[PDB]
């Protein structure tokens, strides 16, 4: 998959510094376009970053801060768009990269040619050379009056001169292959971009970063939209009009807008709108419904929208950081929550600022009916009287449209829970899972983490948990009645996939049909007690169904 959602985490410290380099690699591996921000923060000096060699396009900004790596291999990145900016002013931010000595040594951005919107921020880098020898105006867009240069030139080492074979002195490295390709300040006439000085070498008006010819199907990047190799200005409409009567007829060439490309259908986790936009949230007077196949769709409604529940970051909870006792009553009977759910340390104990009562462990029973979360789940505190997360038994799917820190969709931190708690969690739509620094945490490696993910960019990061050798040597090892050794925790319950038969929520063996007081009928390996008040039998099947007609008498 070449479309990977980026991270949303500024200079803020990581959750688990040990499993951080394993978080960047499990997210930008085999990716070419980043639908978000590219943030490279808090990397050790000897970290290997070979997985960042294929990044080409970034929708958001580029953040490179607090790193001791000598080289960042982002040599094949052409265009950064800048839909959202760092401090609302910058599109490229290289800060605080310093301690043979460690720290960033060279920028190594050889193909950067177009920044549509934003600025560049380079401050406090002692080991960085060649940072002020680049004509940054060329890389900035023609329609960008926000292009402000803030470059710090405080260096702790002596730099080398650029390669003499380079025409001028604009180089990103000392080697001969580190020159800069001037594109905009060398054009002849009113050409926004040109591959050379000749007017015939001018690029098409839809070329973003450059061109390999005069045509409109060979731009290095598409300025507005990418129509399967055709740099267009708009995606083809989803409907055609009679233009006299103006009637609606479906267009077989209808494409949907998804970032900077035209797509036949919206991606798996996204939503398709009648206007022709791949959304994560339906617009006003629209509604999210499931089609016959099972895909997600934003569909209109004449009647007012049904009352839905909202979580953190959503309509009236856009600024709440954790679930307190003030908003705990809102999630009453909500079979679906539009938004996230966070439990910070300040949730189960009252806040001195206000008269906030602390979260009693019996108040968390309102979540015993929740079945779907469209955002992340973040539990960094949990009562010690509750051994697991058994309040989320009915939680089936966490879609992860909104990700905590921009990467994680299921995070547990310092809980001290017993095994896992999460019984029926069967799907993580997007974002990684991070279960770390829980001392009494067993049952981590025995979860079908591949049967819950939905894309190759999802993974499981875990560290500083209970050692596995101590977990097995206690009699807690996925009781064998669970099929294929996939268990959620100790007991006849917590089996991910049953092997023989079910009796309610617990994994059981051959039913009590022939030797039980309630006579049962096995429907897809499910013991179900039915009262045989027609004919007491002693080893024969009494009832075929729950109705009176199916009874023996």
């Amino acid at each position, epitope marked *: 998959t070449q479309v990977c959602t980026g991270t949303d985490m500024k200079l803020r410290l990581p959750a688990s510094p040990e499993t951080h380099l394993d978080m960047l690699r499990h997210l930008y591996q085999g990716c070419q376009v980043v639908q978000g921000n590219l943030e490279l923060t808090y990397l050790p000096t000897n970290a290997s970053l070979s997985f960042l060699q294929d990044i080409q396009e970034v929708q958001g900004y580029v953040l490179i801060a607090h790193n001791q790596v000598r080289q960042v291999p982002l040599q094949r990145l052409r265009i950064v768009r800048g839909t959202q900016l760092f401090e609302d002013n910058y599109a490229l931010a290289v800060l605080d990269n310093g301690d043979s000595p460690g720290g960033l040594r060279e920028l190594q951005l050889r193909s950067l040619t177009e920044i549509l919107k934003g600025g560049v921020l380079i401050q406090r880098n002692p080991q960085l050379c060649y940072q002020d020898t680049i004509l940054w105006k060329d890389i900035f867009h023609k329609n960008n009056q926000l292009a402000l240069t803030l470059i710090d030139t405080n260096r702790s080492r002596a730099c080398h001169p650029c390669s003499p074979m380079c025409k001028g002195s604009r180089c990103w490295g000392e080697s001969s292959e580190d020159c800069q390709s001037l594109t905009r300040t060398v054009c002849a006439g009113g050409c926004a971009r040109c591959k050379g000085p000749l007017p015939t070498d001018c690029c098409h008006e839809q070329c973003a970063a450059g061109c390999t010819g005069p045509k409109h199907s060979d731009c290095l990047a598409c300025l507005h939209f990418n129509h399967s190799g055709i740099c267009e200005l708009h995606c083809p409409a989803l409907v055609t009009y009679n233009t006299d009567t103006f009637e609606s007829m479906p267009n077989p060439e209808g494409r949907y807008t998804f970032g900077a490309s035209c797509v036949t259908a919206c991606p798996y986790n996204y939503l398709s709108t009648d206007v022709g936009f791949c959304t994560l949230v339906c617009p006003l007077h629209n509604q999210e419904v499931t089609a016959e196949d099972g895909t997600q769709r934003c569909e*209109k409604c004449s009647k007012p929208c049904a009352r839905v529940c909202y979580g953190l970051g959503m309509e009236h909870l856009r600024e709440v950081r954790a679930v307190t006792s003030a908003n705990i009553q809102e999630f009453a009977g909500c079979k679906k929550i539009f938004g996230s759910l966070a439990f910070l340390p300040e949730s189960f104990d009252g806040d001195p600022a206000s008269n906030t009562a602390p979260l009693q462990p019996e108040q968390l029973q309102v979540f015993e009916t929740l079945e779907e979360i469209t955002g992340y789940l973040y539990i960094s505190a949990w009562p010690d009287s509750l051994p697991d997360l058994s309040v989320f038994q009915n939680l089936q799917v966490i879609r992860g449209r909104v990700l905590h820190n921009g990467a994680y969709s299921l995070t547990l931190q310092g809980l001290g829970i017993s095994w896992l708690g999460l019984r029926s969690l069967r799907e993580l739509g997007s974002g990684l899972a991070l279960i770390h620094h829980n001392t009494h945490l067993c049952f981590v490696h025995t979860v079908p983490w591949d049967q819950l993910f939905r894309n190759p960019h999802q993974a499981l990061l875990h560290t500083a948990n209970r050692p596995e050798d101590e977990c097995v040597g206690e009699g807690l090892a996925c009781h064998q009645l669970c099929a294929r050794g996939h268990c959620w925790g100790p007991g006849p319950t917590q089996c991910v996939n049953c092997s023989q038969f079910l009796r309610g929520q617990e994994c059981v063996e051959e039913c009590r049909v022939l030797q039980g007081l309630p006579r049962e009928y096995v429907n897809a390996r499910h013991c179900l007690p039915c009262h045989p008040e027609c004919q007491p039998q002693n080893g024969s099947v009494t009832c075929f169904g729950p109705e009176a007609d199916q009874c023996v008498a």
Partner: antibody
Amino acid sequence: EVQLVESGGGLVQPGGSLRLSCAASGFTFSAYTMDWVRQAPGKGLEWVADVNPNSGGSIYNQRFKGRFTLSVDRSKNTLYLQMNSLRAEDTAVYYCARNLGPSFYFDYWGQGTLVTVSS
Amino acid sequence: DIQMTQSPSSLSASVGDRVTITCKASQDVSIGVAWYQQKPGKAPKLLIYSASYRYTGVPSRFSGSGSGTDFTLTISSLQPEDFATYYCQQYYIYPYTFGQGTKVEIKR
């Protein structure tokens, strides 16, 4: 908060051309259908046209098709309305509303820039 | 084209009375009818959609009704803020045409 500001209003001779703009903010631009409405001085309201931000497919009125020309610039959340061959009936205030779902009713109108034509 | 006609074109009422405004179309626009409000000099604001549902952020002293060709906008209690012009509109079929306006003003 959603707020829309129009511009381009002024005074031109009959037959002259103008181009009204309507910048949007506070909401996702490429998610709603954008519109232009006009009201003659001391008269009622008259829907003018209809534009789509993603495809660009514009829906005009039969009395205005051929003279007016809509456009969309998603790079700066701006609408464009090119008026050509203005007659003496084109003196009014030009609102700039938006669709909720692509059924033609409005909730968040603009400010109502004024266009007047006279010799 | 559909002619969207209100009746009456002008009305006077005191604060606290009951105001009834009727709009009528020349074609079947059963539930494709909205309502608006324009004070002198400021831009219009949505009040009713689908002829029976209020918009978010609108007081409860508004109740549209009527289906087919007859429609009605009613205010249960008047306040010294809703003295303005009330328009009706149809979006059921192209073209989409507003009404001529109904002016509601204080009585003495």
